[PDB]
């Protein structure tokens, strides 16, 4: 009988939160940004095409120098590209070919990856032997690894399909903090610019804000109607955007603790795989199942442009730290680099 | 810029070494055919093929038929929700689906599993090799008469054996009447969608059946050949 009692108290708390969010919803982001001029039409050309992967690409991550990037393919190889020259700097053969995520360390000395093997493998790029070797295998997750992001050379946060996120100490190989509370598979995570907080999106159609040091969920964001596949912090750290299978993108605010804007179109009926922001945050780039990448106006919810250069699913995309270019990865095994021209 | 000039040459020379290794790996990657093994726990999917390795939480089975390498993957260490990691196998040659024919209670669940996998948006172009395992148990259950299939499937009351059926010699007509009924349940889902992009290959197999490796080879040969006719129309 106590379970029924707690079920009703939860509804009262949910109504209290919903009323609190409605109380501070005095205006709409659309009304605030109505006066500003639109960004116009955004035209981007494919400057580079990265060829070499034999299987569908599942993840990519830029290095902090805005020149090197690492891309993970499903054939079992990790390749590091020099985007300026399209030269391959490294090719790391993976023990398990079913990799789903990859991360580039901010120092540039390490890369991470992992997939259906439930392991986050750390690879040392700067060895005296001249070859890339596995330095750490982070075991402990009971589901597939969906996303991973370095905090520094010694700390990394991983999200798994066992509904939990973990913070790992690479030197000791143990997970210092475990982030629990999602009821579905966590598909993505994004780090705040100060690396004190991170948001994660799961298959329960909810986004949770986690405190890295404290290790608990600070805020929960709802609004999506299907599994969340992508998430990305706003450049100032006070907001984030998500992408779900319901063909919508939503902009949530941390301080207002509610959704601010929805980015959807009637023609779009396919799921969203990846999201990222431009350096100023004015543009939101989202990848879709229809082989296209739509550039949205974050403030005005206008489709600024379309990146149509892939013949299969766009699985990932990312914008460089300096904002100079955007790379898009796809299931057709190719990577493309995009930027505009004057 | 003389110092910088040779730096690009060194990076370009390292690129060629990587490209040479990628070509060697490309030959091995395309010479191996990857299969996804599916089925419930009661199904004997782990013993379908008579080199077995366990890599992380994935059970890898590698066998060679007529100098062709097949790499069959079984996913064990995952939760019951599989609508996300099933997309990792969207480029496999075929899906191996194993069903316990004698298990009438869980037979409807196997149909629902087949229906979702068949109609998955990322699996619309992948053929399925269907193994209706444990036929000897099905024969005993029908002959005993303790359990009636019509109790679980009302359509069995007014079902007739197909004219194209090829029952084994010395087989009870009741057994082959019900043996082909379960097969048509999976073929009804198969033939109601797909639009020709993929087909289903039903087989009758038992626990002591060493020909299942050959059957996969023959079916994947027809899958690849049908794939070639579609994507190599313009040579």
């Amino acid at each position, epitope marked *: 009988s106590e379970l029924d009692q707690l*079920r009703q108290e939860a509804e009262q708390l*949910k109504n209290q939160i919903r009323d609190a969010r409605k109380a501070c919803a005095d205006a709409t982001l659309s009304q605030i940004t109505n006066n500003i001029d639109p960004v116009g039409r955004i035209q981007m050309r494919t400057r580079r095409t990265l060829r070499g992967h034999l299987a569908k690409i599942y993840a990519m991550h830029w290095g902090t120098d805005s020149r090197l990037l690492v891309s993970a393919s499903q054939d079992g190889k990790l390749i590091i590209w020099d985007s300026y020259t399209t030269n391959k700097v490294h090719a790391i053969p993976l023990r398990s070919s079913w990799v789903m995520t990859c991360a580039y360390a901010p120092s540039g000395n390490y890369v991470a990856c992992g997939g259906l093997d439930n392991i986050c493998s750390i690879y040392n790029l700067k060895t005296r032997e001249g070859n890339v070797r596995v330095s750490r295998e982070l075991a402990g997750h009971t589901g597939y690894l969906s996303c991973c992001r370095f905090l520094d050379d010694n700390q990394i946060v991983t999200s798994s399909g066992d*509904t939990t996120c973990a913070l790992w100490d690479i030197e000791t190989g143990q997970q210092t903090t475990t982030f629990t509370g999602h*009821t*579905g598979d966590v598909m993505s995570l994004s780090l705040a610019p100060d690396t004190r907080l991170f948001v994660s999106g799961a*298959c*329960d*159609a*909810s986004a949770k804000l986690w405190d890295v040091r404290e290790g608990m969920c600070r805020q929960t964001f*709802t*609004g999506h*109607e*299907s*599994d969340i596949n992508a998430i990305c912090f706003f450049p100032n750290g006070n907001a984030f955007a998500t992408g779900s*299978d*319901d*063909a919508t993108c939503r902009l949530f605010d941390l301080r207002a603790d509610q959704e601010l804007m929805t980015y959807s179109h009637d023609n779009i*009926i396919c*799921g969203i795989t990846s999201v990222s922001f431009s350096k100023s945050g004015r543009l939101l780039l989202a990848g879709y199942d229809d082989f296209n990448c739509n550039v949205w106006d974050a403030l005005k919810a206008d489709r600024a442009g379309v990146l149509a250069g892939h013949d299969n699913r766009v699985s990932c995309l990312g914008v460089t730290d300096d904002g100079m270019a955007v790379a898009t990865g796809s299931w057709d095994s190719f990577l493309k680099i995009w930027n505009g021209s004057s | 810029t003389e110092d910088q000039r040779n730096e690009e040459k060194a990076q370009r020379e390292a690129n060629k070494m990587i490209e040479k290794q990628l070509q060697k790996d490309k030959q091995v990657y395309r010479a191996t055919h990857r299969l996804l093994l599916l089925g419930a726990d009661n199904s004997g999917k782990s013993t379908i093929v008579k080199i077995y390795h366990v890599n992380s939480g994935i059970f890898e089975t590698k066998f060679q038929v007529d100098k062709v390498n097949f790499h069959m993957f079984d996913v064990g260490a995952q*939760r*019951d*929700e*599989r*609508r996300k990691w*099933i997309q990792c196998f969207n480029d496999v040659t075929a899906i191996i689906f194993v069903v316990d024919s004698s298990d009438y209670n869980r037979l*409807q*669940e196997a149909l*629902n599993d087949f*229906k*979702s*996998i*068949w*109609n*998955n*948006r990322w699996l619309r172009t992948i053929s399925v090799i269907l193994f209706l395992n444990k036929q000897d148990l099905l024969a005993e259950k029908v002959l005993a008469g303790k359990s009636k299939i019509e*109790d*679980y*499937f*009302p*359509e069995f009351a007014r079902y007739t054996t197909p004219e194209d059926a090829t029952p084994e010699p010395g087989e009870d007509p009741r057994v082959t009447r019900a043996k082909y009924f379960i097969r048509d349940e999976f073929l009804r889902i198969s033939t109601a*969608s797909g639009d020709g992009r993929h087909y289903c290959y039903p087989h009758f197999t038992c626990s002591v059946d060493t020909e299942n490796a050959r059957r996969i080879f023959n079916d994947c040969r027809d899958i690849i050949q049908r794939m070639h006719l579609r994507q190599y129309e313009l040579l």
Partner: nanobody
Amino acid sequence: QVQLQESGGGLVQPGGSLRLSCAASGFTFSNYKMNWVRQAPGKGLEWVSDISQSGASISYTGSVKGRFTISRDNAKNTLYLQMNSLKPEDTAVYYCARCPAPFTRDCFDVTSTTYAYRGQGTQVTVSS
């Protein structure tokens, strides 16, 4: 927030009739295929029936075929399950399950142990 509220049910004598109602909120009800899932005591969850987005396609489990009728009201955002000629083997907790993605023919994980888009469930008892 996606939420489903199952209403109806209770204690009914064998051979009686019972109607279940599922109230949908937090999503566009007309864009999703809906399912009915039950869990008998001592047994796992099993799929009972599903109805397509427009109601054109309808399926049932063979154990309940000819006795259960499933209908949906997109305008009312409500799902119904008419259960007549009930049997003591139908005593179970009935769940209203939504397919994970819109505009799809597949429905993968509705009959799973921990499914996010499934309601709390309603108790149906048929034993006299």
